[PDB]
Amino acid sequence: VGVDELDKIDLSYETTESGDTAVSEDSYDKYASQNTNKEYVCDFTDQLKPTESGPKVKKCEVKVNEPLIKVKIICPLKGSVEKLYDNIEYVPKKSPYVVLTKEETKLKEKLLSKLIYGLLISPTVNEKENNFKEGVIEFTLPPVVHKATVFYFICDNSKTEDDNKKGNRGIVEVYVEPYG
Amino acid sequence: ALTQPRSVSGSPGQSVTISCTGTNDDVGEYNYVSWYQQHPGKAPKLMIYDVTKRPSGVPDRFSASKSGNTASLTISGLQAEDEANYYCCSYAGTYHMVFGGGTKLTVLVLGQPKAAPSVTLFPPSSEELQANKATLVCLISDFYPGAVTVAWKADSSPVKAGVETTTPSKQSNNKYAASSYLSLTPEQWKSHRSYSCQVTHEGSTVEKTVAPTEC
Amino acid sequence: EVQLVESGGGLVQPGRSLRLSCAVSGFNFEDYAMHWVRQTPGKGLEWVSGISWNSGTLAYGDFVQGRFIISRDNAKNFLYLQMNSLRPEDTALYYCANDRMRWIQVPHYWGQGTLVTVSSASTKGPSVFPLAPSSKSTSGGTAALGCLVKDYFPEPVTVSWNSGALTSGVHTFPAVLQSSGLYSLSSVVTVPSSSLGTQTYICNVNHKPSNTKVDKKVEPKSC
Ligand SMILES: [Cl-]
Ligand SMILES: [Cl-]
C-alpha cells in the first residue's frame, strides 16, 4: 500500500480518556488484558454491551515489558448483533498505524511507528484488513525498547441506547516499559 | 464536501427533491443526516434531523430519506414560504461535521411569460473618468424566468477580462433584477469605439452597444 | 426564548488573529455541544469547529489546519473561537450554533453571525458616481437611473434612496468584489420619462466601517 495511506493521520480533533461521558477516572472499571501465550488481548465484545448502569468506562490495561509481544484488540462491529452496537465508534480510524497519545490533558493522534521504532504491523489479520472496520487490530512490539511509551485506543459504544440500557466507553491503555 | 444540485424550482403544490451525496465515511456510515433551510438575510433553521425526523413545528410536507451514500429532502406541495437555500449536513466521524454545498429553491408561478429583459447599459460617467476610473454598468430587470448569462465585447472582439456579474433575485412583480459590471481604465474606454453588453436568453442574443462621446 | 449572539468579527490583515465570542441564553448551555460554522456571503455553509458539552471532544474543519482554538465557559455561558494566522479565504460570516445532543451531531439553533474580513486592503469609504439617465428613448417610456457605489472596503454598505422614501422600482443590488480587492455595487430605480424633469432622486450611501455617509443627486445626461 502507498505511504499516503499508511501515514493517514487526523490531527484536527482531540479527546480525553473519558470523552463525552461524565465518568471520572476514580469511577473507571480498570482491568488487565488477557494473557494468552505471548498475546495480550483486550476483548470489548462483552464489556461494551448496553447495561442499565451505562455508560461505564471500561479501561483495559496492557502492560508490556517483555519482547516480541503481540497486542490484539477486538472492538465489536456495528450490526454484528442486533441493536447492541448500533452507534459504536472507534478512534483512531487508522488504528493500529495511528494511536492516541497524551499531549498535556488531551489525547491526540500519533503514528505508532514514529513512536516505537522496531514496530511490526501486519496489513491483515486472518485475511481481513488490520483496522477496526473489520473488528480486530493487531501489532507486535520490537525486540528492545529504550524509552517508556504510553498510547491509547478508543472503542466507544456510549451513544448506543437500547431501552433503559446504554453502551459503555472502552479504552485501551498500552504501557510499554523499557525492556531489553 | 457533500454534493448538492445548485438549484431546484417548482410552482406551489408541486414537489421537489434535493439530493445530497456524500461518501461511505459520512452519509453512508451514520444515521446522522440533517437538513437546514436558510432564507435570504436570515440564519439557518433545522428542518430534518437523524435522516428522517422533523423538529416540532416543521410542516410535514418536508420529509427526507437516505440510501447508501445519498440523502434526499422532499418538499411535497411546496409553498411560497419555502423559497430558500437548503443545506444537507452529516456527521463525518471523529467528532467532525460536514455540510453540503447548498441548493437554491425557487418558487415559481406555473405558466407565466417566458422572456422580457430590459437591459440598460451605462457608460462611465464624467466624474468617474475625472477620478481616473471607468466602469460600464449593465442592468437587467423586469424579466421572468431565466438563469441565463451576460457577455461583453469591445469593438468586434470579445471581452473576457474585468467582468463581474450578480445572480438574479425576485421583486414585487416577481421579476429578474440582476447586474453586471465591466471595469476599465480611462484609456481603454477612450480607445475602442464601442463596448457591448450582449446577453443571451432562450437562444436569443440581446445586445446593447455604447460608444465614447464628448460633448 | 433561545438566542445566541456572536461578537468579535472585523477586518484583519493576513497572518493576524481574531477571537470570536458567542453569548447564549434560553437553554442550559453546559449540557449541549456547540458549533462554529461559516458562510462566505457568496457561497455556502462550511463547518469550522465543534466542542462537546464537557469539552471531552472537539474538532475542526479540514481548512483550519491547527490555526484555530475552540473553547467554552459553561459558567458564563460563552463559546469562543481563537483564530490565528488568518488567510484571505477565511473571509466569511461566522455563526455559532448549539447541538440537539451533548455530543457533536446536529446543529440546532443558530445565531446571527459576525462578519470576518481578511485582506491587506485597508478600510475606505466609497466613491459614488451617478448612473445618469439618457433621454435617447431607451424603450421610449421608461428610464432607469441609478448610482454606482465604487471601491469601498470592507463590507457592508447600506443604500437608502432619499432617506427611506423611494421604495418601489429600487433594487439596491448586492456587492461584487473587484480585482483590486475593493467592493462596488449599483443601486438603480426605474422611473418613467416624464418623471425626470420634475422629481428629485438622491441616493444616500452609508458605509459604517469607514464612518462615511454620501448623498448624491442623479440628474439626466445633458451638455
Ligand atoms: Cl415522515
Ligand atoms: Cl463543511
Author numbering:
A (entry chain C): 552 to 731
B (entry chain B): 3 to 9, 11 to 27, 27A, 27B, 27C, 28 to 95, 95A, 96 to 106, ...
C (entry chain A): 1 to 52, 52A, 53 to 82, 82A, 82B, 82C, 83 to 100, 100A, ...
Task: Give excerpts from the publication.
Pfs230 is essential for Plasmodium falciparum transmission to mosquitoes and is the protein targeted by the most advanced malaria-transmission-blocking vaccine candidate. Pfs230 is a 363 kDa secreted protein containing 14 six-cysteine (6-Cys) domains and is important for gamete adherence to human red blood cells and subsequent oocyst formation. Transmission-reducing activity (TRA) by antibodies elicited in mice has been found to target the N-terminal region of the protein, and the clinical Pfs230-based candidate immunogen contains the first 6-Cys domain of Pfs230 with a segment of its N-terminal pro-domain (referred to as D1M, amino acids 542–736). To elucidate the structural basis of antibody-mediated inhibition across a range of potencies, we determined the crystal structures of six antibodies in complexes with Pfs230 D1.
To understand why some mAbs against Pfs230 D1 acquired following natural infection lack potent TRA, we expanded our analysis to a low-potency mAb from bin II by determining the crystal structure of the Fab of RUPA-38 bound to Pfs230 D1+ at a resolution of 2.1 Å. RUPA-38 bound to a discontinuous conformational epitope on Pfs230 D1+, composed of residues from β strands 6, 8, 10, and 11 and loops 1, 7, 8, and 13. As a control, we also measured binding of Fab RUPA-38, which binds in a distinct epitope bin on Pfs230 D1. As expected, the binding of Fab RUPA-38 was not affected by any of the SNP mutations, compared with WT Pfs230 D1+ binding. By comparison, the epitope bin II mAb RUPA-38 possesses sub-nanomolar binding affinity for Pfs230 D1+ but lacks detectable TRA. While the RUPA-38 and LMIV230-01 competitively bind to Pfs230 D1 with partially overlapping epitopes, the angles of approach differ considerably. Instead, the angle of antibody approach toward Pfs230, in addition to high affinity and complement-fixing subclass, may be critical for functional activity. Indeed, while the mAbs in the study were isolated from two donors, all potent mAbs, as well as the non-functional RUPA-38, were derived from a single donor (the Dutch expatriate).
